[PDB]
Amino acid sequence: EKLFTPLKVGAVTAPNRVFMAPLTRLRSIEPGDIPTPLMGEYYRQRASAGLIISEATQISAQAKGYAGAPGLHSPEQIAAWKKITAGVHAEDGRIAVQLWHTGRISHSSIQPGGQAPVSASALNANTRTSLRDENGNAIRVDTTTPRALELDEIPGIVNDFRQAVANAREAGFDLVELHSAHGYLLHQFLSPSSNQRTDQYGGSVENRARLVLEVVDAVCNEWSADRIGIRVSPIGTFQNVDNGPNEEADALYLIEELAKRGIAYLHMSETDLAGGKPYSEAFRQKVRERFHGVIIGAGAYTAEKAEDLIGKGLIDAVAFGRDYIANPDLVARLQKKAELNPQRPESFYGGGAEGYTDYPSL
Ligand SMILES: Cc1cc2nc3c(=O)[nH]c(=O)nc-3n(C[C@H](O)[C@H](O)[C@H](O)COP(=O)(O)O)c2cc1C
Numbered sequence: 001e002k003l004f005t006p007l008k009v010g011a012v013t014a015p016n017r018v019f020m021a022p023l024t025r026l027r028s029i030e031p032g033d034i035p036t037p038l039m040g041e042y043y044r045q046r047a048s049a050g051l052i053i054s055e056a057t058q059i060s061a062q063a064k065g066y067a068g069a070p071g072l073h074s075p076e077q078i079a080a081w082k083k084i085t086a087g088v089h090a091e092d093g094r095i096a097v098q099l100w101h102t103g104r105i106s107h108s109s110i111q112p113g114g115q116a117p118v119s120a121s122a123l124n125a126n127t128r129t130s131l132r133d134e135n136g137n138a139i140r141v142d143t144t145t146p147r148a149l150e151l152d153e154i155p156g157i158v159n160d161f162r163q164a165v166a167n168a169r170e171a172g173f174d175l176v177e178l179h180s181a182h183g184y185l186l187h188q189f190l191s192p193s194s195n196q197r198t199d200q201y202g203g204s205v206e207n208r209a210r211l212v213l214e215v216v217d218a219v220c221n222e223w224s225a226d227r228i229g230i231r232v233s234p235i236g237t238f239q240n241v242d243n244g245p246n247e248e249a250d251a252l253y254l255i256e257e258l259a260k261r262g263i264a265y266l267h268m269s270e271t272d273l274a275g276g277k278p279y280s281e282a283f284r285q286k287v288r289e290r291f292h293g294v295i296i297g298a299g300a301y302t303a304e305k306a307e308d309l310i311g312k313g314l315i316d317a318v319a320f321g322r323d324y325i326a327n328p329d330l331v332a333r334l335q336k337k338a339e340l341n342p343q344r345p346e347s348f349y350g351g352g353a354e355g356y357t358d359y360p361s362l
């Protein structure tokens with residue numbers, strides 16, 4: 001089956017098209033937002049993936065929106081991630097780091113100085129984030145109303161993405177994935193629903209896409225375009241962030257701009273976990289004719305759907321999320337048509353080994 005055939009993805013070659021989606025698990029050490037040996041073990045268990053895309057990782061301390069999410073900005077974080085990439089490479093895997101700034105999906109209590117988080121504009125996300133209680137357990141909390149970034153703060157954001165990509169190179173990641181989806185900072189600028197700015201970073205689609213394209217250019221210049229992927233969720237609503245009244249045209253504009261940079265891949269998150277409308281094959285064809293790198297699809301895929309769309313030439317790979325949580329050897333299971341392990345969603349976020357490294361292989 002095409003699912004188990006190789007694929008060139010920028011600077012690396014995936015041996016199969018079964019990718020591990022980025023999956024926030026909120027198990028990092030605080031203080032310091034530091035990856036752990038347990039996280040290293042979890043990723044090593046999944047190293048047969050065509051590509052592992054890490055959990056979303058902070059570009060800076062300001063980027064933090066969830067207690068337990070790791071960073072890639074401090075020396076201690078870099079040191080810990082080096083162990084994780086080494087372990088994946090020891091098993092002949094490939095790993096990309098997903099890099100985010102959460103923007104307004106955050107809480108003042110985990111921001112520098114205990115201050116309001118930042119965004120394109122000053123309106124509340126009307127979403128929940130996850131903090132930790134006094135015993136270290138994950139709890140759901142309402143997001144804090146953000147402050148609009150000043151114009152003079154925007155270059156610093158771009159620089160933080162640049163620096164985090166430099167750090168990713170040092171840490172031995174194979175690729176980086178920019179988190180431009182799911183209502184986080186880059187998507188907050190992209191969407192008219194979250195961006196009411198009247199300067200060069202809001203209004204028109206060109207203005208709304210300006211920040212993400214500055215970030216893409218900065219990180220391509222820092223490392224290489226064949227090391228850079230981007231995740232978008234440009235059709236539908238994700239965590240209360242829609243894509244405005246011209247979502248298809250605006251998506252195609254962004255994709256045409258991304259193509260000019262010659263980046264490694266475009267990762268399309270197709271639906272929110274709470275549901276959304278399917279992509280049409282016509283839209284997939286419009287994306288395909290505008291982007292000349294790898295296209296990854298995600299969002300409640302089955303192997304059957306993946307094989308269908310890869311066979312139709314519309315996408316190149318599929319990222320599985322929850323099936324990868326529950327099946328470290330998902331590749332082997334799909335190749336052999338074996339049953340999958342049951343999921344335990346109660347242990348997706350926070351905690352320890354249970355519901356993390358205790359899902360068995362065949
Ligand atoms: C526990 C959990 C954590 C997730 N964390 C992230 C994340 O860090 N970054 C991201 O872009 N998407 C994240 N997602 C979305 C997944 O990458 C993926 O889009 C989602 O799993 C839908 O696909 P599925 O039906 O294969 O699980 C997460 C999803 C879940 C279930």
Ligand SMILES: CC(=O)[C@H]1CC[C@H]2[C@@H]3CCC4=CC(=O)CC[C@]4(C)[C@H]3CC[C@]12C
Pocket residue numbers: 024056066128129130140181182239349
């Ligand atoms: C509603 C709620 O409990 C929050 C707390 C942690 C949140 C998740 C944290 C990780 C995450 C990252 C993404 O990019 C998509 C949304 C998700 C998957 C979030 C969905 C909403 C969650 C589950």
